Amino acid sequence: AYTPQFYPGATKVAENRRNHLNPNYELEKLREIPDEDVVKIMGHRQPGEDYKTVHPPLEEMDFVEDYARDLVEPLNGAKEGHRVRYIQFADSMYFAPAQPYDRSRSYMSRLRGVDAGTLSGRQVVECRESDLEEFSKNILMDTELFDPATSGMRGATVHGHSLRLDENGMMFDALQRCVFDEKTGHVMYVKDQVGKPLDAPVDVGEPIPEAKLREITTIYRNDGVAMRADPDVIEVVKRIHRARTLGGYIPTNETFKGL
Amino acid sequence: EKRLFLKALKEKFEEDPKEKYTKFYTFGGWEQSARKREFVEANEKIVSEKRQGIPLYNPDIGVPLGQRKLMPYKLSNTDDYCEGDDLHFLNNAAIQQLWDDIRRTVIVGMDTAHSVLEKRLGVEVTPETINEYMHTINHSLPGGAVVQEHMVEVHPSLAWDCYARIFTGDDELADELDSRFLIDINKLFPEEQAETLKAAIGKKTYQVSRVPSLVGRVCDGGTISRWSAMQIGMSFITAYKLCAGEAATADFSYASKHADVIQMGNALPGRRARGPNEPGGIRFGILSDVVQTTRVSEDPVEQSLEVVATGAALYDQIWLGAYMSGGIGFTQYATASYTDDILDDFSYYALDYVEKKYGRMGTKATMDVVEDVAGEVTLYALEQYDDYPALLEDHFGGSQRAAVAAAASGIGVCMATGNSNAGVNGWYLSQILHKEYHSRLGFYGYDLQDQCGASNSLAIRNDEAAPLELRGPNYPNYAMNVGHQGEYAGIAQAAHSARGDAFALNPLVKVAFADPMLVFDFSKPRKEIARGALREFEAAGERDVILPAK
Amino acid sequence: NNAAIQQLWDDIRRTVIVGMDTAHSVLEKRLGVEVTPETINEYMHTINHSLPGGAVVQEHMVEVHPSLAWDCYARIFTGDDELADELDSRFLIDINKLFPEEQAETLKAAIGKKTYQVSRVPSLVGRVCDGGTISRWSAMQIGMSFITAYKLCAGEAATADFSYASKHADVIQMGNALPGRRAR
Amino acid sequence: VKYEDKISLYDAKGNLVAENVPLEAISPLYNPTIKSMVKNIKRTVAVNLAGIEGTLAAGKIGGKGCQVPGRTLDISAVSNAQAIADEVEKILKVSEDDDTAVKIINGGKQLAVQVPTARLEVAAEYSVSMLSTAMALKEALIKTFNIDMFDGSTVHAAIVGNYPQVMDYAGSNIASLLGAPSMMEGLGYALRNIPVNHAVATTKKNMMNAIAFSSVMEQTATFEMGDAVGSFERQHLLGLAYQGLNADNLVIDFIKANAKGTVGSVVETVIDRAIADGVIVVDKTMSSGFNMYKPADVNKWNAYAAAGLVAAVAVSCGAARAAQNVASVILYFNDILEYETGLPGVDYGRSMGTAVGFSFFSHSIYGGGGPGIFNGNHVVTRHSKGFAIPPVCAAMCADAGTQMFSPEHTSGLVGSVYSAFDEFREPMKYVIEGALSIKDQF
Amino acid sequence: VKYEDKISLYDAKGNLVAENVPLEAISPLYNPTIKSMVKNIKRTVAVNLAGIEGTLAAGKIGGKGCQVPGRTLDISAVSNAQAIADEVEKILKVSEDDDTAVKIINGGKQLAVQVPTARLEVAAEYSVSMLSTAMALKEALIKTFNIDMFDGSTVHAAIVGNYPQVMDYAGSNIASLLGAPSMMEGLGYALRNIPVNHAVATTKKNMMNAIAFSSVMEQTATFEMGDAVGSFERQHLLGLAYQGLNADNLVIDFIKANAKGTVGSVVETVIDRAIADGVIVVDKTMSSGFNMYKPADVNKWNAYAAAGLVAAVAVSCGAARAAQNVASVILYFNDILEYETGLPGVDYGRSMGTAVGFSFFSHSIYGGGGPGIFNGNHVVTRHSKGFAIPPVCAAMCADAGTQMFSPEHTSGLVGSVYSAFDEFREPMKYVIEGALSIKDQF
Ligand code: F43
Ligand SMILES: C[C@@H](OP(=O)(O)O)[C@H](NC(=O)CCCCCCS)C(=O)O
Ligand SMILES: O=S(=O)(O)CCS
């Protein structure tokens, strides 16, 4: 068949982007945050109650016979009619292990039935609540995709992806949802992602050391690794741009001879 | 290393611009800013006096503002700093007058009117009669009623900004006319520019009518053309006394105020329903012609950057952040293109690279030159963002960064080739290269037109093809999103600054906005915005004489 | 020459009425948020600060001078007497107090048990811009106040639902647009 | 004749219908079914008789929240629906045997009227149907119930909302699939002004049929806009054939191959099929081992990518059973494909930009709303020439009820009226039938 | 048949052609000639090759006084003309037995292109003609002269001109008789866009033929606007027959009877003919004499008054040999008739109101233009439903060169293009023949 190559380039950042894009690549496990702690950090529901429902379970409701719709297996949260909630992150520009477009591409190539959006300041995923919690805890939190110092889960007032880190190597946060504790070195979350305070702070673990961050980040930087050091990615980008321009002008094989 | 943006970063930030760490949450919140404290004191006084206790401004709700250091803003090529609140278009009278002066301008050609008067109406037309007509229209345009005391007239002090001016490409007629109300092309433009403009204009005569600002304040932009036409017709039938019938008067009326009318903007269709002379109908070439820096500067980068500043202040702030969205607005995005010398530094590097490699206009527009110039400029800009953490803090939003880097790339390509569509193609290549570099771009829907752009830059399809000079806010790709249009106008100007052109799209608009009688001087938009941010700009349209003092 | 006629036109121009019932239904059935008169009071407090041009989210904003927007009000009226009873009278347009008994009953019967918000954007906005600015200004500020008063995500599908409701579904314009020849 | 490439034809169930069909057989300029659909869409009008009765009974004329006290009429339109329909048919009939029909829908609660084509031959545009039906309804109501001469104005306001003052039928009880010509955002955009919800309700929430309907409308519009002429015609012909009628069973094949897959798996399937069919070849191998691909057939590659995009939307929004993933799927299908192959996206990035704007205005405060309120005439979704709306229709068909602005909320009258015609309800099978009919003429 | 009305058809010389012709034989919904004229108007486009060459040579792209330095293309469009025409026809061609006429005008400086009807059967409006022609012209110009990839935008601006930004064809060199549907006064107003000067130039300043052209266009438009539906259809059919097609020879008879007369004498002859034909009877005699008159046939009286209005315009403007009298003639013809008989005027005062519009539009400093640029698609002239415009055509045909807006100044290209069609040059004769061909089907 066809063996995918995900991204171009031979630098370390290109390899990390390929690993994030690759669904057969096992993300390294770094933390162990229990499901209740993650659920209470998201702040959508209290751990212990039943899932709220936005529409009756798919078995109860009746649908028209659609052959091309019923041959795609739905998520477990979809057949239970669970409501669609979100998890949102801000990734620092200083060697955060995951980056907005990288996160969106990896999520869309790894998860089923998710809605991913990317900005400069934040990246958000929306899915059914049960599936969202499951994949969030299993992939987004206790893997290399999350750094408690350079990445924080923020639902509103996202600001600090481009600001300088503070004296603890920690991202700026206006609401101060997560706090660095000096007497242990651990980072503790004192509020939910929206900003509502928690009853008890939840420990998310130690921050990743900077040296490790350098070799697992997916961002090109003049100090870490420059895009000038990966000419293949630039060449591919220029080829895509030229192909777009030629197709916009006249979409024929003769025009594409000047590719 | 020497960079043009270094001095502003030194002034704005207390730490070294290369320093990667700082401290937060120690500035006292909104109290750290004098503007916010003045706003709080005002809000208290207004609430108690005028609002009868209904709250207006409550900083204690919502985000706690000022958790970080609220930076001041320089203005490019100007040595004066201001807070970000002073650059909001509602708090800045200079930006409001910038839009007012464009809104209240209509150019009408008077050669068909003269020919109809001479031949059909049997009335002689001489420079003395032209001077008499100019006197009549100058009295009548603001609010006047000629030799009719029984007619209601507008208070003269209410329309002190209303003028009627004349200009012509005919030299002898120009020097035979009164200099009180003449826009002299010869003494306002350099010799070669004046010759080019006179050749483009021809031997024709045009009158510029500046409707008073108050008229556009009370009404909309479509009122300006009607006001101008009505006053022109009245003045024409009052100055020249004619014994012909009424039908001949209808033919003369068409010739005088419905034949050679030039408007600033066109009407918009669909959900953008708007009349003419609204900022969404102004094409990029027209805005480039409005700005007059080609008159007083030979630097192509400065000429493009003044158009960038004006286009940002108009399109991003007024048009998009008020006419189309409203609220606090999109001041951030626009100030990013003209506050510090970041875009100046990037554009100067692009010009230097093009001059060293291809020459000032030494290459025909090909794909290879577009790709290499745009890639080089984008890489330089992004590494500049990388190695100066204070710079990244200054341009905190991804959009403001993307727009600046892409504008530098497009200006560089336009310098190299002299083609505006090649420049916009370089802009789009810069945008996608930026996205791959930083794994980031602007907001959620910032790059709708940047993914569609490469294909639409050189397209020939009906709704996709247009020269960048003929594009504007109503171009379907550019209709909605912020952070593009002012830079597009700057790129369109840079296409012609490379060739040393006297104008971009319309000579008449250039000559008309060379007028010294305008309140906002378009020779230095950045300086005037700086003056307005300091509360030292004298704007028009104030109803001080019809309001109680208490 | 008459500031009263200008203010008449300004007051008519800057008025937009928004029905805040579909938005409440979205908050109740999609976001699982409970709407009570206390929450409505908090929302009114928020929007009276946001509509003139104050900042509620997105750290580091600039704000318009309150002196230029002293005429900017966000008012609420309802045909539901029980809901109108426990509402902050500062932001309430009381039908019972402003209208005689028979007229008040007729107006309540016509309006029904529905809640509406009246936004009066500053006159300076309609004077700098045109009259098409008002609905968009009100819609943006309504969406911002909704997402900051109920502690929601700043941008999701329900945000689009709020925006569509406040932009056209539940909005009342003083004057319709005139596209085509009229061009306004 | 001028195109040598053939296509196969598969139904909505993936069964083969015919092979070696010329590409031009599905062309809007040749296919009889597409011509019939365009002709019938211009003359069919939906009438809300119950809405008329309710508006007149309460004096609810004037649009949103508007009542005129004193202008109240008590009529029984729904009870006399047969008489009203007979009178309207008599008024609109041209001679004796034209295609004038007024069928009764929902027990007289709605009317589906079709003005004769003879009334549209001598008309420059399509607005004659709505105006003629409005006048016929006014006359029938005035003559059935002996309405006073001073109340015909109220009747007119009940049927059309504020038409002389507002160039539209906003508060009225008369509707059509196409919008008013004053709402067009560009020249030739008349056929693009059909909202997604209207297309989904017309096809009764059938995914393949909704895709076919939306694609046929969008590509016929591109023909009308002058975009699909000259050297641009083959691209749109292939886009309609592959994304819209699953020519080579590409859509069903990709969905079947990715029943429990993600968007990336769909991208991999699309690239593998394109390589196997010879559409794309390896241009060069880079230093890092990246295999840059070039299209051996540019338009065929575009068609393959568009079919894959529809399949990816179907897979993702069927896994989630929510129609809010459409914009993200359309964006990131193209985003992953371009940097996996080095090839341009579905519409040379024009579909990606439409997806970006769709994501923006479907997740923000600045406008838009649910995916069902967008159309090809919308300022946000007008940018891709018929390659982005069919996926939106498929996704809204896959929705399970998480959207408030669902077809039921938005298109109840239009959907119920237009579902009664087999050509509108199942466009896919009838377009295939028309192509089979004209198969041998090329 | 549903109308028992019969008419006798007379040619432009006052000779009898046929008798007892059914009134619906001249209906727009039945007459083949009116159908053919509507189709030809829809599908015909005029191209100004000399204008394109001049605009490109000087870089004069833009609306008015606009000119882009550096974007100048030096091509010989007029010199070749035929390679361009052949390429445009080849691009626009749909089939072999296909209309697709592209014809050379004025020795190469203009093109008269007729888009095939196949491209208009699958279009919801008429705008496909100009868009398709613009695209074909762009492709032909880019291919004939090897235009660089970076100048196609310049070529587009020269052909269409500001279109994406400014939603029309302002500074372009391509034109059609119908304007953009987004720029209409109301719904269905597309056909009331041809000015009086265009009608006069097309018919080569023949009074009866220009009257027939204007009347046919106006009444077909009324049929399109939904106005001529039901009870109003008879009035508009009679108006067309008696005001445009000289039915019963009323216009010629009134003109002959008032060769040396005034407007008052024309009113007298009209009333005498109406009394003699049984159209009006005596209502009652008041105390002070003045026997009031009531119409025994309301629609026929309106038609007689309309024919008399045309005759009065002809008489007055042939006495003055100037076309500036139309407004006053119509206004005071209606006034004198009303206060002479106690009867309503033409169109129940709408003709008089439109005449007031003409007066204040062409007779003051707040006037604008002259009578030659009158059309029904204007805010000032829309009020009469095809009863006030056709007489202006007679007025402008009678003008002896004393108008600034003469047909030669404003409609030279229009006349050169559309005078080639027989049904446009002599609308009266060919409409009469078409009505004769369908006499027996009623
Ligand atoms: C709530 C929204 C959704 C939306 O439609 N607009 C918001 C908020 C809105 C409000 C701010 C209301 C207030 O002051 O509280 C306004 C002013 C629009 C309006 N007229 O109401 C605005 N943004 Ni936004 N907005 C901006 C920006 C940005 C950048 C911030 C970069 C970053 O640090 O993360 C990001 C986009 C991103 O995804 O990256 C952004 C997002 C967002 N922006 C997100 C989420 C904000 C969050 O922090 O929770 N703005 C900027 O990049 C600077 C310019 C700035 C605009 C005002 C100005 O020019 O001063 C402002 C423009
Ligand atoms: C898309 C459309 O919104 P609607 O859904 O039609 O209301 C359109 N808005 C805009 O263009 C918003 C532009 C300004 C805010 C976004 C700048 S990034 C408009 O108001 O007509
Ligand atoms: O972030 S959003 O794209 O919602 C708008 C930015 S102001």
Tab-separated table of C-alpha atoms in Angstrom, chain B residues 273-412:
chain	number	residue	atom	x	y	z
B	273	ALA	CA	-25.507	47.453	2.447
B	274	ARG	CA	-23.969	50.944	2.598
B	275	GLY	CA	-23.985	54.111	0.563
B	276	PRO	CA	-21.047	55.662	-1.233
B	277	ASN	CA	-18.199	57.412	0.579
B	278	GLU	CA	-18.028	54.687	3.222
B	279	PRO	CA	-14.669	53.120	4.145
B	280	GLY	CA	-15.660	49.729	2.752
B	281	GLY	CA	-15.933	51.097	-0.773
B	282	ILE	CA	-12.512	52.755	-0.951
B	283	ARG	CA	-10.158	50.818	-3.209
B	284	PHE	CA	-6.543	50.295	-2.194
B	285	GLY	CA	-5.218	52.445	-5.032
B	286	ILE	CA	-7.590	55.242	-4.040
B	287	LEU	CA	-6.304	55.168	-0.467
B	288	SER	CA	-2.721	55.143	-1.740
B	289	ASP	CA	-3.545	58.252	-3.774
B	290	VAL	CA	-5.180	59.893	-0.745
B	291	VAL	CA	-1.932	59.709	1.230
B	292	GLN	CA	0.524	62.376	0.071
B	293	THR	CA	4.022	61.231	0.964
B	294	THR	CA	5.168	60.813	-2.633
B	295	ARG	CA	5.106	64.622	-2.650
B	296	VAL	CA	7.477	65.202	0.268
B	297	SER	CA	9.591	62.030	0.363
B	298	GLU	CA	11.686	60.082	-2.137
B	299	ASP	CA	12.061	57.050	0.141
B	300	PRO	CA	9.922	54.176	-1.205
B	301	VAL	CA	9.723	52.359	2.125
B	302	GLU	CA	8.476	55.469	3.929
B	303	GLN	CA	5.939	56.081	1.161
B	304	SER	CA	4.604	52.541	1.527
B	305	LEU	CA	4.595	52.671	5.327
B	306	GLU	CA	2.580	55.889	5.504
B	307	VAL	CA	-0.062	54.218	3.343
B	308	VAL	CA	0.163	51.180	5.630
B	309	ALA	CA	-0.464	53.366	8.684
B	310	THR	CA	-3.395	55.178	7.074
B	311	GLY	CA	-4.901	51.936	5.801
B	312	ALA	CA	-4.549	50.296	9.192
B	313	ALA	CA	-6.168	53.227	10.988
B	314	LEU	CA	-9.017	53.308	8.470
B	315	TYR	CA	-9.737	49.697	7.504
B	316	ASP	CA	-8.743	47.836	10.662
B	317	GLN	CA	-9.852	50.366	13.240
B	318	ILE	CA	-12.762	52.366	11.866
B	319	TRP	CA	-14.201	50.171	9.113
B	320	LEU	CA	-13.733	46.733	10.650
B	321	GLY	CA	-13.715	47.420	14.390
B	322	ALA	CA	-16.701	49.764	14.301
B	323	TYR	CA	-18.614	49.679	11.012
B	324	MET	CA	-18.511	45.878	10.859
B	325	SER	CA	-17.988	44.667	14.440
B	326	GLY	CA	-18.210	47.397	17.085
B	327	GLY	CA	-17.275	47.242	20.733
B	328	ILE	CA	-13.794	47.855	22.115
B	329	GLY	CA	-12.501	47.341	18.601
B	330	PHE	CA	-9.488	46.155	16.647
B	331	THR	CA	-7.063	48.902	17.625
B	332	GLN	CA	-4.472	46.361	18.629
B	333	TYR	CA	-3.937	44.952	15.174
B	334	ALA	CA	-3.669	48.323	13.468
B	335	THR	CA	-1.305	49.880	15.995
B	336	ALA	CA	0.978	46.891	15.502
B	337	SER	CA	1.631	48.098	11.945
B	338	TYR	CA	2.574	51.692	12.809
B	339	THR	CA	3.563	51.987	16.489
B	340	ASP	CA	7.159	50.820	16.780
B	341	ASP	CA	9.687	50.682	13.979
B	342	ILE	CA	9.219	46.914	13.758
B	343	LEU	CA	7.564	47.057	10.347
B	344	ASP	CA	9.978	49.841	9.403
B	345	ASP	CA	12.947	47.626	10.255
B	346	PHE	CA	11.499	44.645	8.395
B	347	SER	CA	10.677	46.705	5.294
B	348	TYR	CA	14.096	48.364	5.267
B	349	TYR	CA	15.714	44.931	5.417
B	350	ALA	CA	13.490	43.760	2.554
B	351	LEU	CA	14.445	46.786	0.449
B	352	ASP	CA	18.134	46.287	1.211
B	353	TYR	CA	17.963	42.607	0.253
B	354	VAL	CA	16.138	43.359	-3.004
B	355	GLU	CA	18.569	46.152	-3.898
B	356	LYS	CA	21.576	43.936	-3.206
B	357	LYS	CA	20.232	40.931	-5.118
B	358	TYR	CA	17.847	42.005	-7.902
B	359	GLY	CA	18.207	45.783	-8.066
B	360	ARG	CA	15.608	48.419	-7.326
B	361	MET	CA	13.401	47.318	-10.230
B	362	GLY	CA	15.852	45.050	-11.996
B	363	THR	CA	13.732	41.953	-12.609
B	364	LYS	CA	10.526	40.995	-14.353
B	365	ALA	CA	7.892	39.421	-12.116
B	366	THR	CA	8.541	35.672	-12.086
B	367	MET	CA	7.616	33.020	-9.550
B	368	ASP	CA	11.211	32.364	-8.468
B	369	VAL	CA	11.938	35.945	-7.411
B	370	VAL	CA	8.622	36.120	-5.547
B	371	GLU	CA	9.385	32.921	-3.657
B	372	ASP	CA	12.962	33.744	-2.725
B	373	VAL	CA	12.352	37.370	-1.688
B	374	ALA	CA	9.263	36.486	0.349
B	375	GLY	CA	10.991	33.542	2.010
B	376	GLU	CA	14.073	35.556	2.928
B	377	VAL	CA	12.083	38.442	4.395
B	378	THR	CA	9.784	36.101	6.334
B	379	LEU	CA	12.702	34.144	7.786
B	380	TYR	CA	14.429	37.366	8.841
B	381	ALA	CA	11.288	38.712	10.515
B	382	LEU	CA	10.562	35.473	12.352
B	383	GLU	CA	14.093	35.140	13.686
B	384	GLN	CA	13.887	38.790	14.780
B	385	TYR	CA	10.802	37.826	16.780
B	386	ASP	CA	12.654	34.791	18.137
B	387	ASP	CA	15.809	36.453	19.435
B	388	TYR	CA	14.145	39.532	21.013
B	389	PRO	CA	11.712	38.352	23.716
B	390	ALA	CA	10.588	41.928	24.368
B	391	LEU	CA	9.572	42.146	20.707
B	392	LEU	CA	7.437	39.021	21.058
B	393	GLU	CA	5.862	40.483	24.201
B	394	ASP	CA	5.140	43.716	22.312
B	395	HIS	CA	3.382	41.857	19.479
B	396	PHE	CA	1.618	39.380	21.726
B	397	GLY	CA	-1.075	38.355	19.239
B	398	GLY	CA	-0.215	36.013	16.405
B	399	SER	CA	-2.170	38.070	13.878
B	400	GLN	CA	-0.198	41.267	14.490
B	401	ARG	CA	3.012	39.320	13.918
B	402	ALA	CA	1.807	37.551	10.804
B	403	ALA	CA	0.553	40.771	9.230
B	404	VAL	CA	3.802	42.645	9.874
B	405	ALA	CA	6.042	39.899	8.486
B	406	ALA	CA	3.812	39.358	5.448
B	407	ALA	CA	3.615	43.101	4.771
B	408	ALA	CA	7.401	43.291	4.811
B	409	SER	CA	7.583	40.376	2.369
B	410	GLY	CA	4.987	41.868	0.030
B	411	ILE	CA	6.672	45.268	0.042
B	412	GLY	CA	9.975	43.580	-0.770
